[PDB]
Amino acid sequence: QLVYFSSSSENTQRFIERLGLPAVRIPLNERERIQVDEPYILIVPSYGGGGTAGAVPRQVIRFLNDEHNRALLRGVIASGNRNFGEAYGRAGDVIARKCGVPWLYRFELMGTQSDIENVRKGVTEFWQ
Amino acid sequence: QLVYFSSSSENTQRFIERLGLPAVRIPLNERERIQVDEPYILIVPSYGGGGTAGAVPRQVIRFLNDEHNRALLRGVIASGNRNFGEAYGRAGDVIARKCGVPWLYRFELMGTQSDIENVRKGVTEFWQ
Amino acid sequence: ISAINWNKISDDKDLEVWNRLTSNFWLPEKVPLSNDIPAWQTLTVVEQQLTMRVFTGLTLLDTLQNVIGAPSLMPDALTPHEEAVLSNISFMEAVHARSYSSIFSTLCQTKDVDAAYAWSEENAPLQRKAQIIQQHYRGDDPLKKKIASVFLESFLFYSGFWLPMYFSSRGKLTNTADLIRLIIRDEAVHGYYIGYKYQKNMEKISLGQREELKSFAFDLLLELYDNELQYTDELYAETPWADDVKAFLCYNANKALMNLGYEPLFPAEMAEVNPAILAALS
Amino acid sequence: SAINWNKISDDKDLEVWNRLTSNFWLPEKVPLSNDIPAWQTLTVVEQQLTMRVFTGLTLLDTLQNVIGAPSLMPDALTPHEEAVLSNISFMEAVHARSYSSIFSTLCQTKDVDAAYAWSEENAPLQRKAQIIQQHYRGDDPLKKKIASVFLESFLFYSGFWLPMYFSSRGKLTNTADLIRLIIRDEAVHGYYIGYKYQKNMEKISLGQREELKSFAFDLLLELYDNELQYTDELYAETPWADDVKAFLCYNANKALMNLGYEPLFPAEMAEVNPAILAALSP
Ligand SMILES: Cc1cc2nc3c(=O)[nH]c(=O)nc-3n(C[C@H](O)[C@H](O)[C@H](O)COP(=O)(O)O)c2cc1C
Ligand SMILES: Cc1cc2nc3c(=O)[nH]c(=O)nc-3n(C[C@H](O)[C@H](O)[C@H](O)COP(=O)(O)O)c2cc1C
Ligand SMILES: [Mn+2]
Ligand SMILES: [Mn+2]
Ligand SMILES: [Mn+2]
Ligand SMILES: [Mn+2]
């Protein structure tokens, strides 16, 4: 299973529609909180800009500070843009360093055809 | 005698045209240098903005660091804008504190009618 | 459209003002506004309403300078370097407008802010003012726009800017005053620069046209002046400070005229400011 | 009307306003002087190319400053949209100014002016400048946003390839730092203008979106073909021509994704040498 967040720009959203795999979306509305009952890989876009810790979106932090969802986290994939230098996919290693889970993949915006390809093959071989 | 500098905006120039008193202008062209053979009060606009020393215009420094002109300097009058807070008339007290000559007056832009009356009465009383 | 060369300057003032305005960069987040909360709590209801109505008014005019004012001056630039400076001016007008929202956010209650906004919408003198200014911006004469701009921020704005400067001298809302001083520092350079270019533009038109514009400016000034007296009277109606605000208006009107290359019009009596106000300014 | 930053319609305006403003920088904050020993080791061919690249980028950034961003302002959905566009506009001037900072520190005036004249004469560069300007003067708000996103998220990277290449060789590392600040701005610029294009797509009919999709890909390929020619004339005396073209295809796909479209160029066309991608993101 895959859990993801996407803003009103919906870049990561369109990545998962083109991916094909069944996934659950972390609500854009901050009041509504969603709960997961099975082990998952988290796909999160970066919004740091620099190094002021705010790379991970607020809706994800609220999702992950919940002990139920956090314990079921198995891996993380980060999206973003290479044009942000060292901060490209910053949300990835921040979640990976804090939770202890490994940082799996790294891609840009909606993902290229090579990206979807590598995430499809990557996820299945991860579970095995 | 009065010595003054004014930029291409000519705010100080129009104060002296409305002052009536005989005056000589420090050339706008940096290559052209002028020499003065009489004691004088210097009227100068401020171009600091903040506190990075560069309040005195470049053409005034080249006039002043010449030993001949510096010796005959007797006082300094600054122009500017109150909107620059503490830096209002910064070029005045920078020339004053360095050369040891007193800082006499402080006016805005082209100077008000009050300023012209205050400078006329001030100049005559200074030589006294 | 040519490739800009900052190492081939036609007018030295373009570089000087560019350098000044850019290195003067600031954001409302740089000022610790939340430290004014205790001082805000000690103000009377009258003083609180006045403050909110002053800034809601100033937000309109700075937005006007952001969207219509500074953009309308751009097609009439004499150098390419002038275009770039006007791009900065435009953006900083948005910062100016944005920072008034930072004050409401930190100090005021949402209900009262919206009431102050609705008060500014209904206020006739304010709307009449904004319609006159933008009428000239939508006009076809580039020189009248430059007059309107200088009059707006080097003169008209100071009916509202008086208030935080008064509070400053009383030791209240000192950080809000620090904010306003950053805006005022911007506007001095804005007026100087636009006024300078006004005079440069007049150097390529006939002498008869120059005299026609001098008559126009003084007529427009007195028109806006008479309307601002009405605006002051409605704002400061609950206070006994109107006469002191009007004195401060004439003082800046003279500076606005001097930005354009004209002599000050208002005599000492009318332009005599309370020394505490000038002290808070400097 | 008076802008209110506490009554945000689209939450994305405030996020982008905060990112772009707190990203503020000036070319003076980059130590370009430390690149002079590296510049003296570059060959005559390499130096000539460097200057021709930046004079071309100066024209295009000025176009974005003067016509580009200001032509998007009347077509804004929110008042906050206009304030962000003020910032983009201003920062295009900073971008264009920073290329002159490079010439001042490293290059010789006879060589710089020759490069400017070369850019005047160059046919593909002028063709690119004319085509983009043509859409800004147009009456269609949707095509303006397409042209703007294509220019700075795709076309620029034929020039931006060079500093990143030198960076991977350990040459002109401070110049590349400056470029990475421009690149960081443009990623946000393209994202935002692309995002606002998609919000504008909501109002036009289902069939009207299909015509814009056709237009976008037509414009992309018309500009892509023109950029191949521009690349060949720039990199004529160097074996790097084919590597720049791959870097163009890689960025063209990102330009499309900003607008919410599928990538067009396949992996084998858009495969960039890892050293160039490493210089962009360490
Ligand atoms: C304000 C802002 C900050 C961003 N910061 C980063 C960043 O630090 N690192 C990165 O790789 N991408 C960054 N991005 C790019 C986004 O990660 C990218 O556009 C992503 O596709 C957004 O996904 P979404 O549309 O699902 O929210 C930033 C974008 C914005 C608007
Ligand atoms: C870039 C710049 C910086 C300025 N800095 C100051 C200052 O630090 N203090 C001050 O009182 N006035 C300052 N001013 C205002 C000028 O001193 C004022 O406009 C003066 O009247 C100009 O006279 P001039 O036209 O003869 O050059 C500054 C003006 C500019 C354009
Ligand atoms: Mn303003
Ligand atoms: Mn202004
Ligand atoms: Mn740019
Ligand atoms: Mn841009």
Domains identified in chain C and CATH numbers: 1-282 (1.10.620.20)
The H or E element containing residue C125 is helix C124-137
Ligand nearest to the CA of B90: 2
Q: How many CB atoms lie within 10 A of CB D138?
A: 13
CB contact under 8 A, C1 and D26: no
Q: Separation of B3 CA from ligand 2 center, angstroms?
A: 18
Ligand nearest to the CA of A85: 1
Phi and psi (nearest 5°) for C199? -70, -35
- Experiment type: X-ray
CB contact under 8 A, B84 and C192: no
State how far the Cα of D103 lies from the Cα of D39, in Å rounded to an integer: 11
The H or E element containing residue A3 is strand A2-5
Pocket test for ligand 1, best of A3, A16, A42, A46 (most atoms within 8 A of CB): A46
CB contact under 8 A, D6 and C63: no
HSE-CB of C160 using CA atoms within 13 angstroms: 27
C chain contacts of residue D94, beta-carbon cutoff 8 Å: 22
| Data resolution in angstroms | 2.5
Tokens of C35: 């430290």
User: Do the Cβ atoms of B126 and B41 come closer than 8 Å?
Assistant: yes
User: Do the Cβ atoms of A79 and A112 come closer than 8 Å?
Assistant: no
Q: Nearest to residue D113, comparing CAs of C82, C5, C14, C79?
A: C5
State how far the Cα of C220 lies from the Cα of B124, in Å rounded to an integer: 39
A chain contacts of residue D10, beta-carbon cutoff 8 Å: 8
Strand pairing class (A40-45; A23-26) = unpaired
Chains A & D: contacts with CB separation below 8 Å = 58
Of D24, D63, D93, nearest to C84 by CB-CB distance is: D93
D chain contacts of residue A112, beta-carbon cutoff 8 Å: 253, 263, 267, 270
Query: Which residues face A43 on adjacent strands?
Result: A4, A77
Tokens of C104: 């409401």
Instruction: Give every CB contact of residue C204 below 8 A, 6+ residues apart in sequence.
Output: none
Buried b (16+ CB within 10 A) or exposed e, B111-124: bbeebbeebeeebe
Q: Whose CA is nearest to atom 10 of ligand 1?
A: A80
CATH architecture for segment(s) A1-128:
3-Layer(aba) Sandwich (3.40)
Three-state DSSP at D255 gives: helix
Annotated binding site of D: 61, 92, 95, 152, 186, 189
The response to whether residue A72 sits with its C-beta less than 6 Å from ligand 1 reads no
Can you tell me which atom of ligand 1 is nearest the CA of D192? 31
CB contact under 8 A, A9 and D12: yes
Of C7, C71, C95, nearest to D73 by CB-CB distance is: C71
Tokens of C153: 């921020």
State how far the Cα of C277 lies from the Cα of A108, in Å rounded to an integer: 55
CB contact under 8 A, C181 and B85: yes
Query: Which pairs with CB-CB distance under 8 Å and at least 24 residues apart come from D117-122?
Result: D118/D52, D118/D55, D119/C3, D119/D52, D119/D55, D119/D56, D119/D59, D122/D56, D122/D230, D122/D233
Q: Separation of A81 CA from ligand 1 center, angstroms?
A: 7
Q: What is the DSSP string of C151-175?
A: HIIIIITHHHHHHHHHHHHTTSSHH
In B, minimum Cα distance to C24 occurs at B49
Indicate if C100 belongs to the active site.
yes
Strand pairing class (B73-80; B40-45) = parallel
DSSP C173: S
Chains in touch with C (3+ beta-carbon pairs under 8 Å) read B, D
User: Do the Cβ atoms of D97 and C4 come closer than 8 Å?
Assistant: yes
Ligand nearest to the CA of D194: 1
Instruction: Give every CB contact of residue D279 below 8 A, 6+ residues apart in sequence.
Output: D164, D165, D167, D168, D176
Domain ranges within chain A, ordered by starting residue: 1-128
Is C212 marked as a binding-site residue?
Answer: no
Top residue of B12, B15, B81 to mutate, by most chain C CBs within 10 Å, is: B81
The response to whether residue A90 sits with its C-beta less than 6 Å from ligand 1 reads yes
The H or E element containing residue C260 is helix C242-260
Sole residue written with tokens 């960025």: D251
The response to whether residue B57 sits with its C-beta less than 6 Å from ligand 2 reads no
d(CA D228, nearest CA chain C) in Å? 22
Tokens of B8: 């291409």
DSSP D151: I
Q: How many CB atoms lie within 10 A of CB C164?
A: 25
Q: What is the DSSP string of A75-90?
A: EEEEEE-GGGGGGTTH
D chain contacts of residue C60, beta-carbon cutoff 8 Å: 1-2
Q: Separation of B46 CA from ligand 2 center, angstroms?
A: 5
DSSP C96: H
